[PDB]
């Protein structure tokens, strides 16, 4: 049974925590719920840590007093099909292998599944750790509760005696690096300096051996990623987001200065000795758009190259941990600002960007966002009970499973079938334009080998490579983004028509050049 | 927002409560969750109650930490 | 009404049958149920047949005393979609036409449907008899009971006056031959010598006119294929299986000598005059793995060519009826042992193998097989009744229709939704790797015409053709096999990654050679 | 060793989650999997319901006959 500690004694040296804890709705929650500090208190001074106290990062530390929120989070949605490859005719990107050739995603890119599995799925996907990590057997893929208890309770390591990234099966890659983990867990929140810069007090950084780091991590989506444990108030902890919104002065809503001021963020920094070490961002309001933007954005979390001279940008560079915080029409400018691209296409040789799940940046400017709707309203609504105490569902999933609470309460003019039909109109139209964008990209890509073998000039090929950057950007944004157009249907439409326009211009350029060489 | 009270001050006069509270699974649950005793503490003696403290009997006093059982 | 005959009189000349009939659970079942022997008995001696007695091969000969087993067998599973072509984007092999070009399967290859239809489906598929046979009208496709009563009750022949194999519509083939029929019916069990070798007592053999043979056959999956009619005990009758397990000494479980000894087979031979004619294999136990392996295996049942010199291997050769009895990693060695391949690819010119439904050989070594689980446990379980006499379901179908009896009785830790999710994880992952294997095979195939036209050497093309054999084998095994990885998920994974590895090696070889010719 | 809670406020069964004790104190008819069939593996839900109804039907028959005889005496 837990025994309470003297919090006032802790506060004699912890004034920063005092000012948060004593004012919020956790003022009566004793430190012993989350810290074991007995030896710390026996050996510390106000200027010397002494023995390091233990801090609990497990989700059960919150589930004891907040069972309903914990259980709704850990629920597995069995209809969210698992390990489903996107590069297939019946999924999101039928021509993905041809279009992405040269990038690590060619080895595997599955559709998302329930949040309980995010850390284990990161560890076992074929593109990440060369197949080093597996579930203990094929039965354990069902076990959401086990994954939450800890990744290493359900997984095995092929070689516990080595720590290098290498291939254990032939058709795998080693794309994982320490930055990835910041969108899978925050178990390392006290062992990682802001942005993953080198720091005397950091156990882990951008340049660590990712296999060693992986073995130190256990829990998915810690409850404290959106809720300060001391004040209980709304926050973010993801470094890259705080950097974009506060350090770079872009604001929580870059396209709306007024909303940015009303729904803003305050950066709070914590020190080790007299040096800044880590930071959080306290939110003015309980704004789910910004909470969810800790992960559901386009980002850099990987090495790449410079657009200016083609030189390598490695994990040691700050650009290896970067939130662009730009919509599809501002992205090229944002990438130019940091002089960066991701890979060279295996067939065309073009410098290309790699886009990933930009839900937050896509939602900006949509009819729902402009009317003050947020992610939570459709994806984690309040529960409706005939008799009971209301709480907020933490099962972050498609509104198809809860149309009454996540749709029809606002849209009283519609039946459930009508609302579903409106969703499907958008997704069907958007998907058609994705498929057509891929057809034209593929037609262009296939002309590059023909042109090279026909003796077409490098000047013409380089013109075509410049068009490929844009044709790719304005297509891949939408296969990367999870709503199939729903979050911003007019933007998806304008973007995909731009992609097809760019591919067509390149196809004409190359066909004319090949024909001229044949004629000569 | 609830502000915690010093339980040790209560325990000086309430040994039976001390013996039960410090041992069980509510040892970390502050008295302010169910009692308002500020005037009581100012006026009581070891054998006389003084001003009567308020005691919450509503079920919602348990529902904030045990929603599933309440619902 | 049937009138019993004097069995003791039959036994004065039929000692082999006596020793089986008198000991098993059919000791009280009179011969008149299955034989009309009145004229035979009037004219025979112990050394001269006299008039040939009639033997019933219809399934109704068993349904009279075993209605529950008969009805569960004949049931049609309407959810098993009919006449569904595999070479389509939404089925098993989206790029099958490009990859199989040069083989008869290009004309049609549908998914399987219920067992009642196996003989009629064999007769009407576009690749088999040049479109000679059709159902009487498009309504008869529903009639499972009619098909069981007899193929010729539901089908028509376009030209009853000719017996040659030829095309009656343009996009058909004439791939059918007498060996095929041994996995569709055993109506010919007394008219076919072991392996289909020539024999004075055989009406039919490997070299017969298959159209004439077809017209003599009626019933699908005879009840006696797994059950001896005289002893009622467990057996197999398929010649090719007895040849692999007993004649070639490979055993019932080639990878487990102990299991092979405990769950073995005894070959019993029947004579015509003093010459061996036909055989069966009595099983030590009622082992469904070996019963189902009479048909659910990779096989030769067709002409082909020699790997050594490219010469024709015709139906007259014993190799035209062959069970390889090898897993995917031993198959190439097994084919080399008999110096055989199936076809030359239409585009690449490579000698290639044709793989077919190897469920039995795939199941070997899987976690379920190693734990003593068998086909029947998942595909024809015991029925569960609140009040009743238990029998074994003979409706051999996916466990999705009976998860309580075919899955959850063993896996008490799971709900039905959880078990289905585990199946889907495997199938989704395996399918993704099939689609990627096809992408790389197609990329290689398309380079052959480019290389030839560029003047690449035959030595380089032959190196590429050798890689194509392996790339094909390690892919097609899995489109041919019906579980989409479920029967052996780790094996499917290792095989498909090998296919992609082989295709990639060939693509690099050819691209480098083409580039060199361009440079020269 | 069975108690009221075993039939009327059982532990909740969850595919993935933290187990807690149902506090909805009600007839086991609404939760037969948790309140009955976990102990009685030999029965389907319809069989267990039939066993309850056999007892209740027989007992009610005797309550009604008891009332008939009481009423006859009173009159
Ligand atoms: C003064 C004598 C202190 C007392 C009383 C308590 N703490 Fe402390 N703590 C103290 C110092 C000087 C530091 C290090 C600050 C730095 O420069 O790095 C700490 C640190 C912590 C931490 C963070 C540990 C980490 O992983 O980095 C925690 C979680 C913490 N302290 C908790 C804590 C508790 C619960 C106390 C009362 C039970 C307590 N501290 C008292 C100094 C002193
Ligand atoms: C019991 C000992 C608790 C522990 C452990 C945790 N929380 Fe808590 N929480 C507790 C109480 C009594 C309250 C106030 C209830 C009320 O409405 O008066 C809360 C409140 C929160 C909130 C709401 C805050 C607000 O709206 O301002 C949140 C978001 C919250 N708690 C989160 C939370 C987290 C993430 C925990 C694990 C680190 C956690 N709580 C533990 C009681 C207890
Ligand atoms: C926050 C900015 C993230 C970073 C950094 C990384 N990931 Fe990610 N991941 C993120 C989200 C919001 C999602 C769900 C939406 C989606 O489109 O998938 C994911 C998903 C995955 C998955 C599962 C799906 C799949 O692609 O197979 C995996 C396996 C995964 N992520 C791996 C991964 C790797 C290897 C990373 C570093 C190179 C990485 N993630 C970083 C958010 C973020
Ligand atoms: C960000 C992705 C979140 C994660 C991680 C966790 N919660 Fe949460 N929580 C979130 C939102 C958007 C809200 C509603 C805010 C609003 O007022 O609209 C909440 C709310 C809570 C509360 C308050 C009571 C309620 O409204 O239900 C509690 C006590 C709470 N959340 C707890 C909790 C737990 C235990 C978590 C880990 C399993 C957890 N939260 C994670 C967003 C996010
Ligand atoms: C000695 C000076 C006391 C202090 C310090 C506290 N309490 Fe008390 N309380 C005291 C007495 C003599 C009595 C009468 C009963 C007895 O034990 O003789 C009480 C009574 C209560 C009650 C019951 C009220 C009722 O309506 O019957 C409660 C709920 C109570 N006391 C609570 C309480 C709290 C929370 C205290 C610390 C904040 C506290 N008491 C201090 C004497 C004394
Ligand atoms: C948060 C400030 C709480 C309040 C208000 C109430 N309870 Fe509580 N309870 C709380 C915690 C942190 C725990 C320990 C959890 C653990 O598993 O360690 C408990 C425990 C209980 C129990 C279980 C006791 C046991 O098994 O020994 C019960 C029955 C219980 N709590 C009941 C209860 C009642 C009736 C409340 C209103 C008067 C009440 N709790 C409030 C946290 C908090
Ligand atoms: C000795 C006078 C016989 C009597 C009495 C019966 N049978 Fe016979 N049978 C006999 C011979 C010599 C043969 C041929 C063996 C050979 O060398 O080929 C047979 C054959 C059969 C067959 C198989 C016919 C076929 O299709 O190949 C059957 C099914 C059979 N006999 C049945 C049978 C029955 C039911 C009898 C009693 C009613 C019976 N036989 C008597 C010799 C003799
Ligand atoms: C009635 C005249 C029967 C005919 C016609 C067929 N079978 Fe039979 N069978 C019959 C009886 C009385 C029994 C024994 C029942 C018992 O359990 O005591 C059987 C048994 C079988 C078995 C089980 C054998 C065993 O477990 O050892 C099988 C597999 C079987 N019968 C198959 C079968 C076949 C394939 C038939 C058509 C050729 C057939 N039976 C006809 C009664 C009768
Ligand atoms: C036993 C070793 C077999 C031989 C010899 C032949 N077939 Fe086959 N067939 C067999 C099985 C186990 C299945 C079901 C599983 C599957 O993958 O289909 C089939 C299926 C068919 C079908 C229906 C499906 C289709 O491909 O359209 C047809 C039309 C068919 N078989 C025809 C056929 C021909 C023409 C054969 C000789 C060249 C032949 N089969 C032999 C088992 C076996
Ligand atoms: C009455 C107005 C009818 C309606 C309504 C449907 N069908 Fe029909 N169908 C009808 C007749 C008189 C016939 C011919 C019967 C004969 O003896 O020749 C048919 C035939 C078919 C067929 C066979 C087609 C062929 O061989 O080319 C099919 C597959 C069929 N019918 C299906 C069918 C369906 C699915 C219907 C509902 C959607 C339907 N029919 C309606 C008479 C009438
Ligand atoms: C192999 C593909 C089979 C075919 C063809 C037939 N049956 Fe069967 N049968 C098969 C198995 C695997 C079993 C169970 C063996 C075990 O003990 O586990 C059976 C069983 C029977 C029985 C016994 C009673 C029972 O268990 O239901 C009978 C009477 C029986 N089978 C009859 C029967 C009939 C009539 C068939 C034609 C419609 C038939 N069997 C075909 C496997 C196979
Ligand atoms: C009893 C005859 C069983 C049947 C029916 C089913 N399963 Fe099974 N399965 C069984 C055992 C003894 C094991 C091994 C357990 C161990 O401790 O190792 C399994 C294993 C699996 C697996 C894991 C496969 C792997 O890691 O390679 C899966 C995915 C699985 N079982 C699924 C499964 C399904 C979906 C079933 C119904 C269709 C099914 N099993 C039936 C025992 C038995
Ligand atoms: C399972 C072995 C039980 C035990 C232990 C307890 N009860 Fe029960 N109860 C049980 C049944 C099958 C029924 C009839 C329900 C029906 O729907 O037919 C009951 C009934 C009650 C009721 C009436 C409920 C209603 O009509 O809605 C009450 C109030 C009740 N039981 C109380 C109760 C008590 C206090 C128990 C412990 C002493 C107890 N039950 C144990 C089954 C079982
Ligand atoms: C008696 C009629 C009860 C009433 C009134 C309340 N609860 Fe209860 N509770 C009761 C039982 C039989 C049990 C299970 C004990 C066992 O070990 O089998 C519980 C349990 C709890 C717990 C513990 C966690 C759990 O098992 O769910 C808690 C936290 C709890 N009860 C809280 C609680 C609340 C908030 C109540 C008012 C709404 C309440 N209990 C009333 C019996 C009884
Ligand atoms: Ca990116
Ligand atoms: Ca073959």
Here the tokens at position C109 are: 């290859």
Annotated binding site of D: 4, 7-8, 23, 36, 39-40
Beta bridge mates, C279 = C269
B69 assigned binding-site residue: no
Write out residues with Cβ below 6 Å of ligand 14.
B 59, 62, 66, 69-70; D 5, 20-21, 23
CB A492 within 8 A of CB A433: yes
Q: Record the tokens describing residue C378, joined without a space.
A: 């998942």
The tokens for B60 are: 């919602």
Residue of B nearest to A386 (CA): B71
The answer, for B20 touching chain A at a CB cutoff of 8 Å, is no
State in Å: Cα C314 to ligand 16 middle.
15
Q: How far is the CA of A422 from the centre of ligand 2 (A)?
A: 38
Is any atom of ligand 1 closer than 6 Å to the C-beta of A17? Answer: no
β-pairing, A351-352 vs C299-300, is unpaired
Contact list, A21 vs chain B (CB under 8 Å): none
Q: Which of C494, C87, C504 is nearest to C327 (CA)?
A: C494
Contacts of A290 (CB under 8 A, 6+ apart): A236, A241, A245, A252, A263, A265, A283
State the CATH architecture for A59-413.
Orthogonal Bundle (1.10)
- How far, CA to CA in Å, does A484 sit from each of A77, A424, A425, A490, A491? 20, 10, 11, 12, 12
A24 CA: nearest ligand 2 atom: 27
Residue of B nearest to D9 (CA): B69
Subunits close to C (at least 3 CB pairs below 8 A): A, D
Size of interface A-C (CB pairs under 8 A): 74
Q: Give CA separation, A219 vs A76, A122, A150, C36, in Å.
A: 16, 12, 5, 75
Q: Which residues partner with A270 through β-bridges?
A: A278
| Beta-carbon-side half-sphere exposure of residue A48 (alpha carbons within 13 Å) | 6
Distance between CA atoms of C122 and C183, rounded to whole angstroms?
Answer: 10
A513 Cβ contact partners less than 8 Å away, ≥ 6 residues apart: A451, A454, A456, A457, A460
**Cα separation values, C1 from A419, C4, C32, C33, Å:** 67, 10, 11, 11
- Local structure of residue C52 (DSSP, 8 states): P
State how far residue C432 is from chain A, nearest Cα, in angstroms. Answer: 5
CA angle, residues C2, C8, C12, in degrees to nearest 5: 130
Contact status, residue A127 vs residue A173, Cβ threshold 8 Å: yes
Ligand approaching nearest to the C-alpha of C228: 8
> In terms of CA atoms, which chain A residue is nearest residue D17?
A71
CB-CB under 8 Å, A169 with C421: no
Give me the phi and psi of D51, to 5 degrees please. Answer: -65, -40
Determine if residue A310 is left, alpha or beta; phi over 0 gives left, psi from -120 to 50 gives alpha, anything else beta.
left
Q: Does any CB of chain A come closer than 8 Å to the CB of residue C373?
A: no
What chains are in contact with A, requiring at least 3 Cβ pairs below 8 Å? B, C, D
Q: Would you say A441 and A475 are in contact if contact means Cβ atoms under 8 Å apart?
A: yes
- Across the interface, whether the CB atoms of C418 and D44 are under 8 A apart is answered no
Which residue among A67, A144, A145 places its CB closest to the CB of D20? A67
Ligand 7 pocket member C193 (CB < 6 A): no
| Residues within 5 Å of ion ligand 15, judged at the Cβ atom | A 354, 356
Do C465 and C349 touch, CB atoms closer than 8 A? yes
CA-CA distance, C380 to C391, in Å (whole number)? 10
End-to-end CA distance of chain B: 23
Residue A191 backbone dihedrals phi, psi, to 5 degrees: -125, 10
Binding-site residues, ligand 13, Cβ < 6 A: D 2-4, 6-8, 27-29, 52, 56
Angstrom distance (rounded) from CA A466 to CA A471: 9
Q: Is D27 on the interface with C (CB under 8 A)?
A: no
Q: Which of A60, A67, A76 sits opposite D15 (nearest CB)?
A: A76
Cα(A97)–Cα(C500) distance, integer angstroms: 13
Whether the Cβ atoms of residue A215 and residue A142 lie closer than 8 Å to each other: no
Resolution of the experimentally solved model in angstroms:
1.8
Tokens of residue C443, six digits: 């990329």
- The answer to whether A92 and A86 have CB atoms below 8 angstroms apart is yes
Q: Residue D22: its chain A contacts at CB < 8 A?
A: none
| CATH classification (class only), A414-520 | mainly alpha
Q: Are strands C304-305 and A235-236 parallel, antiparallel or unpaired?
A: unpaired
B71 and A385 within 8 Å at the Cβ level: the answer is yes
Ligand 5 atom closest to Cα of B48?
12
With a 6 A CB cut-off, is A29 part of the ligand 2 pocket? yes
This entry's atomic model was obtained through X-ray
Element at C417 (helix H, strand E):
helix C416-454
Q: What is the DSSP letter of D10?
A: P
Any ligand 10 atom below 6 A from CB of C142: no
Structural contact between residues A500 and A440, judged by C-beta atoms closer than 8 angstroms:
yes
Q: What's the rounded Cα separation, in Å, for the pair A116 and A118?
A: 6
Lookup: tokens for B48: 């006389």
Tokens encoding A58: 């497990």
- Give me the architecture of the B1-58 domain, per CATH: Orthogonal Bundle (1.10)
| Alpha helices in C75-163, H assignment, sequence order | 96-100, 118-124, 144-149, 151-154
CA distance C369 to C288: 12
CB neighbour class for A245 (10 Å; exposed up to 12, middle 13-18, buried from 19): buried
C-alpha–C-alpha distance, residues D19 and C476, integer Å: 47
- Which single residue is written with the structure tokens 């990933």? A356
Is the CB of D57 inside 8 Å of chain B's CB atoms? no
Three-state DSSP class for residue C133: strand
What is the rounded distance in angstroms from the CA atom of residue A139 to the CA atom of residue A73?
22
* Pick from C209, C151, C149, C221: nearest CA to C178: C209
D-chain residues near C385 (CB < 8 A): none
Q: How many CB pairs under 8 A join B and D?
A: 5
Which residues are paired to A283 by β-bridges? A265
Q: Which atom of ligand 4 is nearest to the CA of A376?
A: 12
CB contact under 8 A, A138 and C426: yes
Q: Do A145 and D16 touch (CB under 8 A)?
A: yes
Question: Is residue D44 within 8 angstroms of chain C, CB to CB?
Answer: yes
3-state secondary structure of C310: coil
Q: Is the CB of A54 under 6 A from ligand 1?
A: no
Give the separation between CA C333 and CA C320, rounded to whole angstroms. Answer: 18
Instruction: Kindly state the DSSP code that residue D12 receives in the 8-state scheme.
Output: P
Nearest atom (ligand 7) to Cα of C46? 1
**Region for A232 from its dihedrals, namely left if φ exceeds 0, alpha if ψ lies in -120 to 50, beta otherwise:** left
The number of beta carbons lying within 10 Å of the beta carbon of residue C59 is 21
Say how far apart CA A56 and CA A186 lie, in whole Å. Answer: 11
Q: Is the CB of C139 under 6 A from ligand 10?
A: yes
The residues facing A280 across adjacent strands are: A268
Cβ neighbours around C324 below 10 Å, total: 23
* Token digits of residue C292: 């189902």
Query: From the CB of residue C258, how many other CB atoms can be counted at a distance below 10 Å?
Result: 8
B23, HSE (Cβ side, Cα atoms, 13 Å): 6
Q: A61-65 — which CB contacts under 8 Å span 24+ positions? A: A61/A33, A61/A34, A61/A223, A62/A223, A62/A224, A63/D18, A64/A33, A65/A29, A65/B64, A65/B65, A65/B66
Cβ-based contacts of C418 with chain D (< 8 Å)? 15
Query: Which ligand 12 atom lies nearest to the CA of residue C367?
Result: 27
Burial of D8 (0-12, 13-18, 19+ CB in 10 A): middle
Residue A86 near ligand 3, beta carbon < 6 Å = no
Q: At which residue do the structure tokens 């076992």 appear?
A: A124
Q: What whole-number distance in Å separates Cα of residue C278 and Cα of residue C236?
A: 12
Which helix (H) or strand (E) element contains residue C270?
Answer: strand C265-272
Pair A492, A347: CB distance under 8 Å: no
How far lies C431's CA from each of A88, A416, C484, in Å?
A: 9, 34, 7
- Tell me how far apart the alpha carbons of residues C193 and C195 are, in angstroms, rounded to a whole number: 6
Out of A76, A88, A137, closest to residue C435 by CB: A88
List every span in chain C annotated with CATH 1.20.140.10.
Answer: 414-520
CB contact under 8 A, D20 and B70: no
Residue D12: closest C-alpha in chain A: A71
Residues of A in contact with C449 (CB under 8 A): none
| Cβ-nearest to A30 among B28, B33, B70 | B28
Indicate contact of B with A: 3+ CB pairs under 8 A.
yes
Angstrom distance (rounded) from CA D13 to CA D34: 7
Which residue ranges does chain A devote to CATH 1.10.287.3080? 1-58
Residue A277's closest CA among A390, A346, A192, A352? A192
Q: How far apart are CA C437 and CA A132, in angstroms?
A: 22
Angle CA C4–C5–C8, to nearest 5: 130
Determine D/B contact with 3+ CB pairs under 8 A as the test.
yes
Question: Which element (helix H / strand E) includes A311?
Answer: none
Residue C354, SS3 per DSSP:
coil
What is the residue-wise DSSP string for chain B? ------HHHHHTT-HHHHHHHTTSTTTTS-GGGTEE-HHHHHH--SS---SPPEE--STHHHHTT-HHHH-
| Binding site residue list of A for Ca(2+) | 298-299, 354, 356
Q: Do C386 and D15 touch (CB under 8 A)?
A: no
Yes or no: say if A481 and A359 are a contact pair by the CB < 8 Å rule: yes
């Amino acid at each position: 049974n837990l025994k309470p500690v003297d919090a006032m004694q802790c506060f004699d040296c912890h004034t920063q925590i005092e000012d948060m804890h004593t004012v919020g709705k956790h003022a009566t929650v004793n430190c012993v719920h989350c810290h074991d500090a007995t030896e710390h208190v026996e050996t510390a001074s106000s200027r010397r840590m002494g023995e390091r106290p233990v801090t609990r990062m497990d989700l059960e530390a919150c589930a004891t007093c907040h069972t309903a929120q914990f259980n709704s989070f850990v629920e597995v949605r069995h209809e969210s099909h698992p390990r489903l490859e996107k590069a297939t005719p019946t999924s999101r990107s039928p021509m993905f292998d041809k279009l992405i050739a040269g990038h690590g995603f060619a080895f595997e890119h599955a559709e998302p599944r329930s949040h309980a599995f995010m850390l284990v799925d990161h560890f076992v996907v074929d593109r990440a750790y060369g197949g080093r990590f597996q579930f203990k057997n094929w039965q354990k893929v069902t076990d959401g509760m086990g994954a939450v208890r800890g990744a290493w309770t359900v997984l095995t390591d092929a070689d516990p005696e080595s720590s290098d990234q290498r291939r254990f099966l032939s058709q795998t890659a080693t794309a994982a690096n320490p930055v990835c983990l910041n969108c899978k867990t925050q178990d390392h929140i006290l062992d990682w300096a802001y942005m993953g810069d080198e720091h005397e007090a950091a156990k882990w950084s951008r340049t660590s051996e990712v296999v060693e780091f992986a073995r130190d991590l256990n829990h998915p989506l810690n409850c404290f990623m959106c809720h300060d444990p001391h004040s209980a108030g709304p926050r973010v902890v993801r470094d890259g987001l705080i950097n974009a919104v506060v350090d770079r002065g872009l604001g929580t809503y870059p396209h709306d200065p007024v909303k940015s001021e009303q729904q803003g963020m305050t950066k709070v920094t914590f020190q080790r000795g007299r040096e800044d070490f880590r930071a959080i961002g306290l939110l003015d309001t309980a704004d789910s758009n910004v909470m969810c933007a800790q992960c559901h954005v386009e980002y850099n979390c990987n090495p790449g190259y410079q657009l200016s001279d083609g030189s390598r940008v490695g994990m040691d560079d700050r650009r290896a941990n970067h939130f662009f915080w730009a919509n599809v029409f501002d992205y090229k400018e944002a990438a130019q600002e940091i002089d960066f691209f991701d890979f060279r296409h295996a067939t065309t040789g073009a410098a290309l960007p790699k886009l990933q799940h930009p839900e937050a940046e896509t939602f900006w400017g949509s009819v729902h966002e402009r009317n003050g709707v947020a992610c939570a309203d459709c994806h984690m609504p309040k529960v409706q009970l005939e008799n009971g105490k209301v709480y907020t569902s933490h099962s972050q999933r498609t509104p198809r499973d809860m149309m009454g609470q996540a749709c029809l309460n606002c849209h009283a003019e519609w039946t459930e079938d009508q609302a579903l039909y409106a969703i499907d109109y958008i997704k069907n139209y958007t998907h058609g334009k994705i498929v057509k964008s891929e057809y034209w990209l593929a037609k262009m890509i296939d002309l590059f080998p023909v042109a090279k073998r026909a003796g077409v000039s490098e000047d013409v090929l380089n013109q075509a490579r410049e068009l490929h950057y844009d044709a790719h950007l304005y297509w891949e944004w939408w296969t990367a983004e999870n709503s199939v157009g729903f979050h911003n249907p007019d933007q998806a439409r304008e973007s995909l028509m731009t992609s097809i326009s760019k591919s067509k211009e390149a196809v004409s350029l190359l066909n004319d050049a090949i024909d001229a060489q044949v004629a000569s």
